[PDB]
């Protein structure tokens, strides 16, 4: 049920993500800068997410209002995908979070949540 949405800012550590998981959060949304990607330069964030994305779904949206994410566009983005991050494609922020919450009401299988999040259920997503 419980989702946590965190905005990516320069210097953000993985420590709050680990605290979230320990608290029993069942999903995390990370609102990134643009097309997507997780910092690894002088940051333990990518390493942390790579570790946690096997345990719970970690979804990436963007702070920008329009055009959505594409983790294939840039190198940092591709790294996030390899780390196990679930892109939100062109979904609104509200649809992304409510969709995740809805899915979490049905399953806890990360790979299953992953395929659901990438599937256009009701018109929220271009898949």
């Amino acid at each position: 049920m419980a989702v946590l949405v965190i905005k990516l800012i320069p210097g953000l550590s993985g420590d709050i993500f680990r605290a979230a998981v320990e608290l029993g959060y069942r999903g995390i949304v990370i609102e990134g800068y643009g097309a997507g990607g997780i910092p690894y330069r002088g940051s333990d964030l990518l390493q942390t997410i790579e570790e946690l994305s096997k345990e719970i779904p970690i979804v990436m949206t963007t702070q920008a209002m329009y055009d959505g994410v594409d983790l294939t566009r840039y190198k940092v983005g591709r790294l996030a995908l390899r780390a196990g991050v679930i892109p939100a494609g062109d979904m609104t922020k509200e649809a992304t979070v409510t969709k995740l919450m809805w899915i979490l009401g049905h399953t806890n299988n990360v790979e299953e949540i992953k395929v659901l999040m990438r599937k256009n259920l009701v018109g929220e997503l271009r898949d």
């Binding site: 690894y40 330069r41 002088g42 390493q47």
Partner: peptide
């Protein structure tokens, strides 16, 4: 910088 540093990357690991």
């Amino acid at each position: 910088l540093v990357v690991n």
